[PDB]
Design a protein around this nucleic acid. Structure first.
Lengths: 122, 82, 89, 83
RNA sequence: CUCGUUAAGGAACUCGGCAAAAUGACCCCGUAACUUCGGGAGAAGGGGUGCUGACUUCGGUCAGCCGCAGUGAAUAGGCCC
RNA sequence: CCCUGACGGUAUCUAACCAGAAAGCCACGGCUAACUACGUGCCAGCAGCCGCGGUAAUACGUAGGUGGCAAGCGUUGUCCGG
RNA sequence: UGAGAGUUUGAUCCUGGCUCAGGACGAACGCUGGCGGCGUGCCUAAUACAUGCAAGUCGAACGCUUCUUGGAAAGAGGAGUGGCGGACGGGUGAGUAACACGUGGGUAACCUACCCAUCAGAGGGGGAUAACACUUGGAAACAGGUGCUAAUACCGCAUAACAGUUUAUGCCGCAUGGCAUAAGAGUGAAAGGCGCUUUCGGGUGUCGCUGAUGGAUGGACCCGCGGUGCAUUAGCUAGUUGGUGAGGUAACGGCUCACCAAGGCCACGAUGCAUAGCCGACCUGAGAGGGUGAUCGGCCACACUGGGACUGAGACACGGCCCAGACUCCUACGGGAGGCAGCAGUAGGGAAUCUUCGGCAAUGGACGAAAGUCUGACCGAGC
């Protein structure tokens, strides 16, 4: 669960490192976000050089939370991190490389361009 | 690789590496087996000196140590026992 | 693998050659050890100049001629002298 | 041994190290543009079997082979001692 | 009312981080602007710490052993612009 | 004795025919070789440095002529000389 | 083989700057163009690279298999084990201010396939394996399992010390030491193929195989001296400088270790920062000098960026391997593939720089006994 003023690492090649969450789009008083949910955020730390510069308001999708997800067959998955990928308003990564491993729920929510580039898809 | 002859060199040299390392380890353990018995003061002390010398000599005819390394080795061992 | 081979020195379609003793790894027109004579493919009875006292010394040290150098070293009677010094003593 | 090495002359300058001494050999050479002669110095290290020679001595040295990271000379003889 | 613990988040609380939590011992390494040249200075930031044996020049160092954790409890600076 | 040329029917040589197909770029006030007309009027323009242009301009723009080189001729940039 | 001129003033002499008259170029661009000969042609992004080609060869080392003329001998194909080559030839100048290069020396601290010479060997055994046949998992790239087989493939046993080392002797040298002769101790190799004579003949020609020594050729290390700007860059070093021993390398050495000491370099420019491959040579000048290092030759460094080793006589490898990184591509999502600063060619940058050509006939190179096969080196043609 990820709420207002949580901080996420970036699993992308876009020029951002840390991100601060501003909204949890979808609903009118919704509290938390999960794996496969879209978000509005601030860039807090960038990389010297990069398409995305610090201070920008931008959209991102969550992969890889600590309090993870639950599957219909009774099994669970959990990660050691919270991470997101910055998105281009029709679900495409604004970078070209995803880092680290990714949850399989991004298929059902139809981020198919992102499930092509992840190293591992769990 | 691209060239057909570069593909054969890969397996040929892999095999050469395998047997080269086997025989070098043989020599190294023979020498060490002599050293650990001269450091104990044990009976059966000249026979394994002979065996270590023979080990080094045979490694030099298998193209594993040059030839000067072998002279050096036999000198060092000679000054320890005989 | 010391050799005795030819080295091109013309302009574009009028070639000339120096007879030279070189290490076989060297480029055809690159480095060499010394020059031993001259050879001219034009000039209908072709012209050969050569010292023939260094050819006999390099030959006895293991240098080896190319195919054309052997032809023009036998037309001069240098291979017979090598024959009469080596396998006669 | 028909080939010959290089021997030099100089005055000893340091004798602190054990078995090693610095010898300064001095010479004059000219200027490339203008004419006159300036003096020039370079220091050498030489080997001492027993830490014998002292400062002010006038020595000879000879070229050997690498004996350390810096020393390439040995001590031939002492010609004239300081007092 | 006085105490102990708490998933995920981590000042979004409130007039205001109020109150809590965090730092805390000894040994070693290091330590900026500025300055009335004394300071600033415990600046900041990092590492070691139990037990057995051998050697211990002396003060310690090497080899080995056990646990999630060795100032294994109690007592003891949060810092920066 | 016998055997091999990508270039290539290339260079070259012989016969016939025809002055017929084949000249441009820069400069001309002083430095620095080479001058007169007309147009325009501190305008339009020129200049490496001196400097030209306001009614008779050998300094601007054309024409005739002349000078330098020539299948090239001028311009800019870079270096040494003076 | 040393030429000068205009321009400060109302006029002058001196001082002084600015400008012009000569050369040259990997040149670009404007106007304009008939030919032959010989040369030259990405100076910028060491930017990213579609497509073809640039390294193979050997049946006279070895077993298999497919044809054309049921037992037949030749000719032409296919993959495999084994040898040698792929470290050359060809490209580029990013790094580098240092033994990198130039010139002059040293190694009594060194290695070297093929080639030439000399001496001595070449004995007798063993256990496998690819191919092939069957079989499993694979999207593919490719991996495993079972059974049979050959050698100049591999492994032990014999015999050889001329090699190294130690002792005595003689001669000698620039410290360490060098040469020659005598002994003593432990030890170490090897492979056949094609022919000739073939009475069993058991002989022999040739090419290969093992050990030792020389030559040649190629590489390695150390030293003197020489070539750049800044002092509005003065302090730099802690394996740092020396010793003892040990390990290590072809080889000497703080090369690397443990201990002991407190040394080393600097105004004769240490250290740092910026720029740069170096030379034969080339342009200009009366010379002394100054400015460049394009075609051609020599030395060095690099190979998409950064680490490492392996095989080998030789590489820390230019069309080789392994790992990390950025980028590009194919995928059934489990995974796989790649490196034009070789020759052509393309997009891009720029004021700016060529054909996706023919041939191994000549010269050189690899393998083979040889015919030959390979060669974008190279010889020619095109703009």
């Amino acid at each position: 669960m990820i709420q207002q003023e949580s901080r996420l690492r970036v699993a992308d090649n876009s020029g951002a490192r840390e991100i601060l969450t501003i909204k949890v789009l979808g609903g009118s008083g919704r509290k938390t976000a999960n794996i496969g949910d879209v978000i509005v955020a601030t860039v807090k730390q960038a990389t010297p050089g990069g398409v995305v510069k610090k201070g920008e308001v931008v959209k991102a999708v969550i992969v890889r939370t600590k309090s993870g997800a639950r599957r219909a067959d009774g099994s669970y998955i959990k990660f050691d991190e919270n991470a997101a990928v910055i998105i281009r308003d029709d679900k495409s990564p604004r970078g070209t490389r995803i880092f680290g491993p990714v949850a399989r729920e991004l298929r059902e929510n139809n981020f198919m361009k992102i499930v092509s580039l992840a190293p591992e898809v769990l | 690789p691209n060239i057909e002859s570069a593909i054969k060199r890969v397996r040929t040299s892999a095999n050469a590496n395998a047997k080269n390392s086997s025989q070098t380890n043989a020599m190294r353990t023979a020498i060490k087996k002599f050293e650990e018995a001269v450091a104990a003061g044990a009976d059966n002390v000249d026979a394994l000196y002979n065996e270590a010398v023979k080990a080094v000599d045979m490694a030099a005819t298998k193209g594993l140590i040059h030839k000067n390394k072998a002279n050096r080795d036999k000198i060092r061992l000679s000054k320890l026992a005989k | 693998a010391v050799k005795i081979r030819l080295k091109r020195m013309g302009s574009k379609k009028s070639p000339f050659y120096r007879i030279v003793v070189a290490d076989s790894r060297s480029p055809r027109d690159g480095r060499f050890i010394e020059t031993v004579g001259t050879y001219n493919p034009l000039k209908d009875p072709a012209e050969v100049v050569l010292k023939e006292d260094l050819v006999l010394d390099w030959l006895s040290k293991g240098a080896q001629p190319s195919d054309t150098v052997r032809n023009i070293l036998s037309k001069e009677g240098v291979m017979k002298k090598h024959h009469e010094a080596k396998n006669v003593k | 041994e028909r080939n010959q090495r290089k021997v030099y002359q100089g005055r000893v300058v340091s004798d602190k190290m054990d078995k090693t001494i610095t010898v300064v050999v001095e010479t004059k050479k000219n200027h490339p543009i203008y004419g006159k002669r300036m003096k020039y110095s370079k220091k050498y290290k030489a080997h001492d079997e027993n830490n014998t020679a002292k400062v002010g001595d006038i020595v000879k040295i000879m070229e050997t082979r690498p004996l350390s990271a810096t020393k390439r000379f040995r001590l031939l003889e002492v010609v004239e001692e300081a007092v």
